[PDB]
């Protein structure tokens, strides 16, 4: 609820908005930066056929998105990235796994910045 | 009750001339549907404007609709709402951005909304 | 209504016919002007740079065109479309051009408007401004001599003191879909081209005399430069529009065709009922 | 009866003439209504032009229309109905305005009709 | 069947053409003469009431279509021409007549271009 | 059945390469139906030269059409294609006539039908 009651914000917005932008002469700032956020969630929400996604995982994947860290790794990387997330926090990040599922709340925000922080140095770009 | 006599007539000559300029943007449905907006000239664009606000305007946040979105309701007075369109209808809010008319209550919410904005 | 909207179906088709056939024409003059502009960037180089050196180099500012004076009153040249049904290319230069002298104008006197293109003229006879000198109907491949007699006019208003500081205002190209509104200064020429590298030149023509020749030959120069950028970006301009256009036509043709597709299954189950409601009861 | 034959070489020629004239009008229309009428070539302009007035002189001054117009009625001759068409249609005509077709007889009428408007 | 191969394609490119293009003259060589043929082709293909033509002459005026003799003459007076064509193949162009309806099958490209040619000098 | 999992992957990648290549040639069509070659970019001049030969080696000569012509005819398995068009895709086989991908089966028959020619 926390996480994601304002994903519909960035979607419902960014589908419409690439209607008029591409017919669109001009686009002032803020709907350039509004078009960036919606493209990862795009490719956020993209998924293959017969792998689901354990709920604890889901919440931190769309926390990074929707916490503007996510912002920085290019639209085809974003997909290799939450493949890499995912494993990351399997071998690593475990007290942030253990919290979630055991209180059905975030973590320390704290904590989950700096790990996100931590994630975002190991990873490498095209 | 839309009658002169029953809402009296500030609220007559206000509603009759809201209607006016909403059905002028219907016949202009079918133009700006493939041209757009470069074929209309003088009068055409002015109307074009004050429908888009004036069609946002008439959109409210309800105490019903917290179970969906997180916003606060409002209750618009009677006197409230009849003034709010004049100033519309007169051009004196023209400069201000179309989606700062939206899920509103009284007409100030507006300038709010706006500065919030800054556009 | 079935009918109705078998005549809409039928309307747009043809309307989506015309404007796949604009796109191709204006497709063809673009490519006409980009070569057009492409050939005078060389003619335009040479005689500018020249020029500037010899005005700027081993001599002080002694030409009214070069020297700057207080301003007593000033004109602005704005050029746009004659024809019309292209998009916001004039509308987007009249916006700076009205609002430039709106947001900093307290006199009608203290501005003139020379103007290039109908739809400006009308603008301009809209509203209510004054023109100076108003040409209209150039050809669709623009020549140096159509604007050389009224660039003599123009350069003949500034030189004489009528106006004593004038802008340009024009579409410049840039992209295939990206054009900018831009606002020149054409003169005085307060500043100047370098190449940094120059020759001995001649001193016998008399240093005002030999100007004479060259500030009037770069004033040409820089509005003919301003009509290469000016129709290139305006043909761009119609292609941009006719393919939205098209592509919004041939959109509404799906979704009318469906709603006549569902009318004539409606129908034609109505008839049916009806048939064998009677011939039940009979 | 529209043959060659059973009514004259000439008759025909300008009948079907007339014909292809209201049907290029027909289809022109869709063109004009929505992308404008300035838009279009000079023999399109022409050909909207002379079929309004065709147009309009197809319309005519009844007896039985003394009840329903005022105007008493008239009754024109098959020979006079020819040279007209045909003026027409060769644009001799084309310079007195589009108002002075509706309900008359004969071409004659037309000219002194548009002297009152004051052409 | 050789003679008609080329007007049924001609006809179709006339088609999606001119329903776009008749409007635009100032433009590419190549679309102004393609939209030439369409219209003579309609021309050559109208035809009065009540007055058959023998196919021998039928063939002989699409080959003209075809080859492009025609481009010369205007679209107007096609429809007179084509009735006059008849009169010279008649009075002079016996051969060329006899051999289609006994053969079935053309006769030899030289002597086809030559009587066509020769009328086309005579036409004015 | 075009999927990774019915076909396998480089079946699947090679099909969907052919789609993309052509697709954008028939833009370039109507580009080149009103204006000539040398006009495109270099990018889609080089998408016009391998479409326009992989449109003639989809084309196959039948066996059935013996009777009519007196060319033989051929049959390719799926493998032999999928290797044929992988190799155009990379353009290994670029240097070689229009005419010789014609009515043709497997790709080493272009290599000796191109040698016919000369």
């Known amino acids: 609820k926390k996480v994601a ?8 917005a960014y589908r419409e908005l690439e209607a008029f932008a591409q017919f669109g002469s001009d686009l002032d700032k803020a709907t350039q930066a509004k078009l960036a956020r919606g493209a990862r969630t795009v490719e956020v929400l993209k998924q293959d056929l017969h792998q689901p996604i354990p ?4 919440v931190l994947i769309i926390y990074a998105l929707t916490r503007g860290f996510l912002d920085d790794i290019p639209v085809e990387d974003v997909r290799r990235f939450e493949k890499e997330f995912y494993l990351f926090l399997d071998q690593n990040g475990q007290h942030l796994l253990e919290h979630i599922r055991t209180t059905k709340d975030l973590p320390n925000e704290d904590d989950l910045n700096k790990a996100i922080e931590a994630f975002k140095k190991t990873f490498v770009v095209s | 009750a839309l009658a002169p006599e029953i809402v009296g007539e500030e609220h007559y000559q206000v509603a009759r001339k809201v209607q ?10 079918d133009i700006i549907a493939i041209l757009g907006m470069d074929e209309l000239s003088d009068e055409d664009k002015l109307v ?5 606000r004036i069609q946002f305007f008439l959109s409210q946040n309800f105490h019903v609709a917290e179970q969906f979105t997180g916003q606060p309701g409002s209750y618009v007075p009677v006197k409230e709402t ?5 100033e519309i209808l007169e051009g004196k809010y023209d400069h201000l951005p179309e989606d700062a008319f939206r899920l509103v209550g009284r007409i100030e919410e507006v300038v709010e909304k706006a500065k919030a904005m800054g556009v | 209504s079935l009918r109705d909207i078998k005549t809409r179906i039928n309307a747009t088709k043809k309307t989506s016919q015309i404007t796949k056939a604009m796109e191709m024409v204006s497709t063809s003059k673009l490519n006409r002007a980009e070569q057009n502009a492409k050939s005078f960037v060389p003619y335009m180089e040479k005689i500018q740079e020249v020029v500037a050196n010899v005005a700027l180099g081993a001599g002080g500012a002694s030409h009214p065109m070069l020297v700057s004076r207080p301003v007593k009153k000033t004109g602005y040249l704005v050029i746009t479309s004659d024809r019309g049904l292209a998009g916001a290319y004039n509308s987007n230069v009249l916006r700076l051009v009205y609002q430039t002298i709106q947001k900093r104008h307290a006199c009608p006197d203290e501005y003139a408007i020379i103007v290039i293109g109908r739809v400006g003229l009308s603008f301009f006879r809209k509203r209510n401004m004054p023109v100076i000198l108003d040409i209209t109907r150039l050809p669709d491949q623009p020549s140096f001599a159509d604007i050389k007699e009224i660039a003599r006019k123009t350069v003949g208003l500034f030189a004489d ?3 004593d500081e004038l802008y340009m205002y024009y579409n410049h190209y840039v992209s295939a879909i990206q054009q900018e509104v831009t606002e020149r200064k054409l003169l005085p020429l307060t500043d100047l081209a370098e190449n940094k590298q120059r020759t001995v030149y001649e001193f016998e023509p008399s240093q005002e005399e030999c100007l004479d020749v060259l500030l009037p030959q770069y004033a040409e120069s820089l509005i003919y430069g301003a009509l290469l950028d000016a129709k290139a970006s305006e043909h761009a301009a119609r292609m941009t529009a006719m393919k939205n256009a098209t592509d919004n036509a041939n959109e509404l043709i799906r979704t009318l065709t469906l709603s ?16 064998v409601a009677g011939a039940n009861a009979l």
Not at chain 3, 260 to 271: G, K, L, S, W
């Open chain 3, 260 to 275: 006549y597709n569902r009318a004539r299954q409606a129908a034609i189950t109505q008839e049916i009922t009806e048939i």
């Open chain 3, 161 to 163: 003191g009528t106006f």
């Open chain 1, 55 to 58: 709920v604890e995982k889901q």
């Open chain 2, 20 to 29: 006016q300029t909403l059905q002028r943007y219907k016949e202009l449905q």
């Open chain 1, 5 to 12: 009651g304002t994903l519909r914000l960035d979607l419902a």
């Open chain 2, 82 to 86: 009849v003034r709010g369109f004049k």
């Open chain 2, 48 to 52: 074009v404007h004050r429908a888009r």
